[PDB]
Amino acid sequence: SSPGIWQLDCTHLEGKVILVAVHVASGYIEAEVITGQETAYFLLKLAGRWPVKTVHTDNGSNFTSTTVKAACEWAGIKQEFGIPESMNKELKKIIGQVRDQAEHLKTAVQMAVFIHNKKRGIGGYSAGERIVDIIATDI
Amino acid sequence: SPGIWQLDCTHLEGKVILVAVHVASGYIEAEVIPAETGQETAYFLLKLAGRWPVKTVHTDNGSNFTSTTVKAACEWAGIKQEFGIPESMNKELKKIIGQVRDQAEHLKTAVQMAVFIHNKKRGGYSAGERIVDIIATDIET
Ligand SMILES: Cc1ccc2oc(C#Cc3cccc(CN4CCN(CCNC(=O)c5cccc(C#Cc6oc7ccc(C)cc7c6CC(=O)O)c5)CC4)c3)c(CC(=O)O)c2c1
């Protein structure tokens, strides 16, 4: 039972910070180029869109943001340390494939997210379909 | 109507709030645009299409037909912009936004709290469960 289990991490590119959330069971990702207020905002707007019940991070930075805890409490997210970067260097390759189609890094990040979530291998389901499948199976 | 959406704008506290509605489910996506249209709308649409099936976006004025960036995003992501929109849920949303406004320093935070409530509440099924139900019923169909 991992419908609402997510992984949260940072990555960096062109001197900017990319927050990345991974739905662990599906591989589905959401990201944004941005501190604690920013992380809390990102988590709230994630949690309004998917079932978000547990978020795992692997360092201490999110345990020291008062707004992040406030977001956790408001939305009912347990923020837990540990495990339930192949994804960040998979996201970075795609960002590289597209970087010249957009003026802003923002945009190239979101095109890369698009491709990651929509792409297949050939057959089966994309990450975007799996997360919907997982959730639909759930209720 | 799996990938059918309608896009509209609302205003609070001197700000603009882009609001995307998945017509069949009532599920909504919103964001406080710092500016007004243009590359803000194109970015919002690209994010949206990276998350959901977005095939047809309906609007009922001419504003989005005059943005080259919006047109570039429609064609990058495979979204047909279509005019006409044949409901009152900017109304609802601001109702919830008022219920929570004192819980957030920033209007955008309070908008996103309103989206949360609208999508999760009921009863039977919430908008958030329906859009998933509708989409999962479809992949297997
Ligand atoms: C083919 C194609 C397709 C798509 C395309 O698209 C584009 C584009 C674009 C673009 C154009 C212009 C501009 C920008 C970015 N612009 C926007 C505003 N940006 C301010 C951020 N500002 C906070 O993020 C912020 C600021 C302050 C506060 C917070 C917060 C919070 C918060 O959250 C909470 C959650 C829960 C709880 C309990 C509390 C909180 C709180 C605290 C509270 O409230 O109590 C957040 C700056 C940058 C982007 C292109 C063109 C291309 O590229 O070729 C393109 C091409």
TrEMBL record, chain B:
Domain called Integrase catalytic: residue spans: 1-135
Subcellular localization: Host cell membrane; Host cytoplasm; Host nucleus; Virion
Highest taxon of source: Viruses
Name the UniProt record assigns to this protein: Gag-Pol polyprotein
Organism of derivation: Human immunodeficiency virus type 1
Residues included from the entire protein: 57 to 210 of 288
